[PDB]
Amino acid sequence: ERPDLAWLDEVTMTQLERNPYEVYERLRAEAPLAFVPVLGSYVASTAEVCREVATSPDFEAVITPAGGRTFGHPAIIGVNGDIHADLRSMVEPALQPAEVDRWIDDLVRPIARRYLERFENDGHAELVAQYCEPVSVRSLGDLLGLQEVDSDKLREWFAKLNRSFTNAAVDENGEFANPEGFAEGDQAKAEIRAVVDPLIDKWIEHPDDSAISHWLHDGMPPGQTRDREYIYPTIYVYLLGAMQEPGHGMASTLVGLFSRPEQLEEVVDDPTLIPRAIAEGLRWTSPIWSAGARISTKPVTIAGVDLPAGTPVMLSYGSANHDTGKYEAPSQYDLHRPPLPHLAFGAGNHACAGIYFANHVMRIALEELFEAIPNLERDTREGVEFWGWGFRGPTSLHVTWEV
Ligand code: HEM
């Protein structure tokens, strides 16, 4: 509807999935808050606007249309008030820093070693499928109580939920343009139910130290549990983003380091720099790139746009993390970038609950990788492609090393 942005009418969903950075560079300059027709929503592209919307008292949580179609209610990312307070209290115990420090090393390090031992003497590997994704899902899967669900299956589930959650394209009338793209999300949920319903049956009668068992029991009156239908949407939140994003983050960090071979050498030589390398990695390609949204609760003015009450705004944190008002040459990976705040974990009341855990998973995984393969190099015979608008990461990461 905005005349000078008529070019946005020609932006396609495929373009945003393959490479959103050119469109979003224009948005950050022309319209930090803009309606994108193919997404059917206002989008916030700059750090100032994302931060304001995510922390404003005049906005509250909502799920995107395709996200809500995929997860239903009450997904922790999309609720407010008393329900959100309860779901936050439910997930937070195992994520508390002092608790994570008690067991994170004994959890992740043996998992990383197990997967590394399968290929560390081959001289070649595709690290997304052989290392980054397995370590991410096996670590969280064991924490949750899903020890008997294979990492192949956890990876398949987050991939299907990813595509369903981000099936956001809409047509002229604002209707989903690809309604059949939700079917594999529905099929993944059906499989998850078949596996998890018996585990919940068991945990209700025999609680244990698994996180989902504690979700059922913690804070409840004696003999009561949270109803499974009340917690399943937050289980899906985990089985998508919590399973996927640490693997995305460590892979993007590696791609970034490979693009700066001098900096990769530094980090291999001095592993205490791995946390700094990961933080730049998350800024450089944010795993949660534009998955979330807020909705206005009152009429509000943002970036010169007068929004009525009830207006959704998508939070494109991955674009915000390339805001040239903050960073110099943000499209380049730079380990020695001055440490600044970033928005890869969001902001406000709905900011990431698992930051401390996620950073440790990524750190320990990179530590063990660089120890087992110090002469790791990227297979330049292959190129690295990134995919995703809602969630973004490399689709593969071929490497080689002298055995
Ligand atoms: C590098 C890995 C990760 C990244 C980049 C990431 C990023 C984010 C982002 C951007 C949000 C939305 C924040 C907002 O809307 O302002 C979020 C929400 C959330 N994340 Fe993380 N995440 C990561 C890993 C994890 C892990 C491993 C867990 C659990 C163990 C987790 C648990 C959560 C939860 C529960 C929420 C919802 C918070 C709420 O709505 O109140 N995250 N995360």
Ligand SMILES: COc1cc(C=O)ccc1O
């Ligand atoms: C932490 O996992 C999730 C986070 C988000 C944030 O927008 C969306 C879907 C997810 O599964």
